[PDB]
């Protein structure tokens, strides 16, 4: 009767909340450091480009 | 072939064991034909050796150097232009080529 409001209506950063397993989805907060050793075959020579 | 005027523009060159430098040359030539290209600087060398020139045009050449700066003399069919750019340190510490 006195549950208040569920976290799905109260979590910040727009986190959607999914159960089974409990998790926060599509939340938008901070920055993600990313590094990517892209396959160098993907480049094209500066002279051919 | 002989060129009336030529210009150099080197971009984002990386000093490295590999041809990590790229530069663009622009030129005005009396005629089309295979001109030789060379780096007269003892500390820089171009991958390409010759290019088929055109009465006017521009060609991009790959080059390698140890010098952190691209202040090297380039020659196309004997004319010369002073290229110059601040080459950045190489991204990968180790490479499979001397």
Q: What's the rounded Cα separation, in Å, for the pair A29 and B97?
A: 43
- The answer to whether A16 and A8 are in contact (CB under 8 A) is yes
What technique solved it?
cryo-EM
Specified resolution (Å)? 4.0
CA nearest to A48 within chain B: B60
Q: Which domains does chain B carry?
A: 3-86 (2.60.40.350)
Q: What's the rounded Cα separation, in Å, for the pair A34 and B29?
A: 48
Tokens of B53: 């020139």
Is the CB of residue A2 less than 8 Å away from at least one CB of chain B?
Answer: no
Q: What's the rounded Cα separation, in Å, for the pair B38 and B78?
A: 9
How many CB contacts within 8 angstroms connect chain A with chain B? 10
B62 exposure class (CB count in 10 Å sphere: 0-12, 13-18, 19+)? middle
Q: What's the rounded Cα separation, in Å, for the pair A47 and A45?
A: 5
Q: Do B61 and A47 touch (CB under 8 A)?
A: yes
Tokens of B42: 């003892």
Chain A neighbors of B60, CB-CB under 8 A: 46-47
Q: Do B48 and A47 touch (CB under 8 A)?
A: yes
């Amino acid at each position: 009767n006195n549950s208040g409001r569920p976290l799905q209506e109260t979590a910040p950063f727009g986190c959607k909340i999914e159960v089974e397993p409990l998790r926060a989805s599509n939340c938008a907060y901070g920055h993600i450091p990313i590094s990517i050793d892209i396959p160098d075959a993907a480049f094209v020579r500066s002279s051919e480009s | 072939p002989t060129i009336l005027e030529v210009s150099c523009t080197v971009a984002d060159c990386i000093y490295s064991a590999d041809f990590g430098g790229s530069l663009t040359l622009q030129y005005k030539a009396d005629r089309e034909g295979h001109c030789p290209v060379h780096s007269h600087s003892t500390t820089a060398v171009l991958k390409e050796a010759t290019t088929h020139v055109t009465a006017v045009g521009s060609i991009t050449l790959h080059f390698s150097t140890s010098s952190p700066q691209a202040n090297f003399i380039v020659s196309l069919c004997g004319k010369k232009t002073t290229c110059n750019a601040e080459c950045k340190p190489p991204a990968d510490h180790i490479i499979g080529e001397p």
